[PDB]
Write a protein that binds this ligand. Sequence first.
Ligand SMILES: *[C@@H]1O[C@H](CO)[C@@H](O[C@@H]2O[C@H](CO)[C@@H](O)[C@H](O)[C@H]2NC(C)=O)[C@H](O)[C@H]1NC(C)=O
Ligand SMILES: *[C@@H]1O[C@H](CO)[C@@H](O[C@@H]2O[C@H](CO)[C@@H](O)[C@H](O)[C@H]2NC(C)=O)[C@H](O)[C@H]1NC(C)=O
Ligand SMILES: *[C@@H]1O[C@H](CO)[C@@H](O[C@@H]2O[C@H](CO)[C@@H](O)[C@H](O)[C@H]2NC(C)=O)[C@H](O)[C@H]1NC(C)=O
Ligand SMILES: *[C@@H]1O[C@H](CO)[C@@H](O[C@@H]2O[C@H](CO)[C@@H](O)[C@H](O)[C@H]2NC(C)=O)[C@H](O)[C@H]1NC(C)=O
Ligand SMILES: *[C@@H]1O[C@H](CO)[C@@H](O)[C@H](O)[C@H]1NC(C)=O
Ligand SMILES: *[C@@H]1O[C@H](CO)[C@@H](O)[C@H](O)[C@H]1NC(C)=O
Ligand SMILES: *[C@@H]1O[C@H](CO)[C@@H](O)[C@H](O)[C@H]1NC(C)=O
Ligand SMILES: *[C@@H]1O[C@H](CO)[C@@H](O)[C@H](O)[C@H]1NC(C)=O
Ligand SMILES: *[C@@H]1O[C@H](CO)[C@@H](O)[C@H](O)[C@H]1NC(C)=O
Lengths: 49, 270, 50, 63, 183, 49
Amino acid sequence: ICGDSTECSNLLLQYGSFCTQLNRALTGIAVEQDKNTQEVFAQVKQIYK
Amino acid sequence: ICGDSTECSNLLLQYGSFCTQLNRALTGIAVEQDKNTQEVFAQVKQIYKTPPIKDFGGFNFSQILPDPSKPSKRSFIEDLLFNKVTKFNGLTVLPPLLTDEMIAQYTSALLAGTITSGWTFGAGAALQIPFAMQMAYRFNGIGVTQNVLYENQKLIANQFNSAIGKIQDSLSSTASALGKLQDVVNQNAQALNTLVKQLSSNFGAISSVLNDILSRLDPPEAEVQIDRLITGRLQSLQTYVTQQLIRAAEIRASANLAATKMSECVLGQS
Amino acid sequence: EAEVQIDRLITGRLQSLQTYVTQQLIRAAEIRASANLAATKMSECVLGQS
Amino acid sequence: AYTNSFTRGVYYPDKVFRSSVLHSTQDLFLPFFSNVTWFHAIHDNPVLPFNDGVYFASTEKSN
Amino acid sequence: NGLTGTGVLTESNKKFLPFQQFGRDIADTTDAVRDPQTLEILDITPCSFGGVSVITPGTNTSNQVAVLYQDVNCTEVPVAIHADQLTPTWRVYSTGSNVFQTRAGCLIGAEHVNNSYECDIPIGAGICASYQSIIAYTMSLGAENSVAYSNNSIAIPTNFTISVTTEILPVSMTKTSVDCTMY
Amino acid sequence: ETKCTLKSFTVEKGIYQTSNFRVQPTESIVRFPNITNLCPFGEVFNATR
Ligand SMILES: *[C@@H]1O[C@H](CO)[C@@H](O[C@@H]2O[C@H](CO)[C@@H](O)[C@H](O)[C@H]2NC(C)=O)[C@H](O)[C@H]1NC(C)=O
Ligand SMILES: *[C@@H]1O[C@H](CO)[C@@H](O[C@@H]2O[C@H](CO)[C@@H](O)[C@H](O)[C@H]2NC(C)=O)[C@H](O)[C@H]1NC(C)=O
Ligand SMILES: *[C@@H]1O[C@H](CO)[C@@H](O[C@@H]2O[C@H](CO)[C@@H](O)[C@H](O)[C@H]2NC(C)=O)[C@H](O)[C@H]1NC(C)=O
Ligand SMILES: *[C@@H]1O[C@H](CO)[C@@H](O[C@@H]2O[C@H](CO)[C@@H](O)[C@H](O)[C@H]2NC(C)=O)[C@H](O)[C@H]1NC(C)=O
Ligand SMILES: *[C@@H]1O[C@H](CO)[C@@H](O)[C@H](O)[C@H]1NC(C)=O
Ligand SMILES: *[C@@H]1O[C@H](CO)[C@@H](O)[C@H](O)[C@H]1NC(C)=O
Ligand SMILES: *[C@@H]1O[C@H](CO)[C@@H](O)[C@H](O)[C@H]1NC(C)=O
Ligand SMILES: *[C@@H]1O[C@H](CO)[C@@H](O)[C@H](O)[C@H]1NC(C)=O
Ligand SMILES: *[C@@H]1O[C@H](CO)[C@@H](O)[C@H](O)[C@H]1NC(C)=O
């Protein structure tokens, strides 16, 4: 929403910390996806041939 | 939104009745959580007390049963569990309906029932049976004949005592074994903190406080600044409510799974 | 100024519509979970034994 | 003469009381582990640029 | 001196450096202010407020209702139901009725009893009330029976009864759509 | 009040939330450090040149 313009940052400075709020959710989503696939497949302790 | 300003009400009645459904949703989720915990733990109709005489074929249940020596009547394991873990600005926190003491009473009743009466008390009434034959029934269930248990009772008792001591020591020493509860508490507190801190944002106006800005400027632009502040704060409130709804749904799903697990992996065999 | 009035009205109405859509999505998801549980129970208990 | 200023140059940015809380502040400060110029008062006093504030460390025993 | 606010003033024991003027804890919530005339520190506490709720047995049975103020002390009860705020005619409810103090606030219009039963109207913190006059007591979990355990005895049933139970599950809701231009 | 909030002439057994109360302030106070001092507008408004 800035396009590399310090005017946008200056105007956003008064809007509060919406930035971190929208940043954290995606990280949480990625973490749970990783844990989800690891849980669904990692069910054995060795490799059999 | 502003803390008891008349102009706030005058301008807000022009916007509708958003607060009605906000409060409705919050009350709904509160009642839902209360019903959730109630249905998770309310699974028995009476209260069973363990007999004072304790000879369970050599098994030792001292560190798992409650004892009448502490004010809270909490057993050793739950005491360690409690010890491991570690405002008025327009919002409040309601107290839970069921306190910890009733939770402990339900846990003790269920534990005594499953030790003494096997698992028949989950269908009809409690029926006596010595512990050794219950062990034999369980082994016969898992496919091993009852002949094995009666020749290795002492070895099984020794293994049980050693294992329970080991798990108690592991819980006492090892840390970071309660990630879920700590994570939930920390994230909820963080969300509340960011919501309450958002109150001080300028939101594009010329002042962050309504009382001062009201009594220092001409009304005609004062309504403009007040409108800016109101729309910003309302947007923040809506975001917080949506987050709360999502979290409540997830917690309900997890608690339903836990209730099913408790219902079938305790009152019987899986 | 009719343009400003129109802008205010439309932004309010869109806010209301967004709120309604979000509520509908949440309720639909919960109902879907309940229906899945009911289907599992019906397929298990009725057509066999528990 | 150059010297390594380890961690000096922190001042109370405001006149507001607090207690046991981390506070983040963006303001004029002396960068840590910096190069500070060292001058001797023997056989001087040269004019120096101001450039948006200045630090001054004096360790002279005699008045 | 310019800093305006509302609340209750109390004596404070905190210590200030000789150059501060007012303190805060978080989120620009000024909490400690020193009076310039005397140079004495004072603490600000927000003025008490809270929600109100009504407990009724249903208008069919009767029309007697008890009132519950959430998170408020007894001393603030009479001064908050005065003849100028919150339905002045409720001032009679501010006294006379036996005021009860719980962990969920204060209760007016309900008696207190030492017994315990299985109630139907939850209040909170293990306390709940019922019409029996409205009376409030402590939750009773259920009847207690002790099973006589002994290491050479069983209990075998002799007669079986069958029963039928009902369960209800929703599966779908109303299918609706909304336009844009028409709205 | 309960009837008005629920918009019905009949109410069943239960607990309902109607409104909130807040204690009103009594009087106002204001302090200024110790004294007052007058600065000389006279010399600005009355000068030789
Ligand atoms: C079950 O195990 C506990 C744990 O050791 C035993 O409790 C001990 O009892 C002795 C004798 O009274 C005390 O000296 C110890 O301090 C106790 N240990 C703890 C951790 O409190 C208990 O005696 C065992 N019971 C049976 C029947 O074996
Ligand atoms: C099966 O395993 C158990 C322990 O896991 C064995 O019991 C102990 O065995 C060790 C060495 O094998 C002995 O030093 C201990 O004295 C045993 N304890 C008891 C209480 O007997 C057990 O011997 C094993 N069974 C067989 C047939 O080897
Ligand atoms: C409600 O106010 C009363 C005062 O009228 C408080 O009673 C005080 O309680 C403290 C703590 O036990 C005592 O040290 C005081 O001596 C009590 N004062 C009096 C006059 O008895 C009471 O604690 C308050 N309750 C709440 C929940 O705030
Ligand atoms: C319960 O088990 C005990 C043995 O484990 C049975 O016999 C008891 O044995 C002890 C030890 O030799 C004696 O001191 C007791 O006098 C015996 N009788 C008892 C405890 O009643 C006992 O018969 C079994 N059944 C019961 C009901 O105790
Ligand atoms: C700092 O001073 C040291 C020692 O004189 C010198 O080696 C270094 O290059 C200086 N760095 C800067 C950034 O001035
Ligand atoms: C002014 O200062 C004197 C002495 O410092 C002090 O005693 C007094 O309380 C202060 N305030 C007044 C006079 O209002
Ligand atoms: C009130 O409750 C009684 C209980 O038996 C019932 O018979 C009666 O029909 C009820 N009346 C109304 C108006 O609900
Ligand atoms: C009943 O409870 C009260 C406290 O509410 C207590 O003072 C009293 O001793 C108890 N017993 C009787 C018989 O009143
Ligand atoms: C300047 O002098 C005139 C002469 O009478 C006087 O009236 C006026 O008040 C003075 N102005 C000020 C600011 O003292």
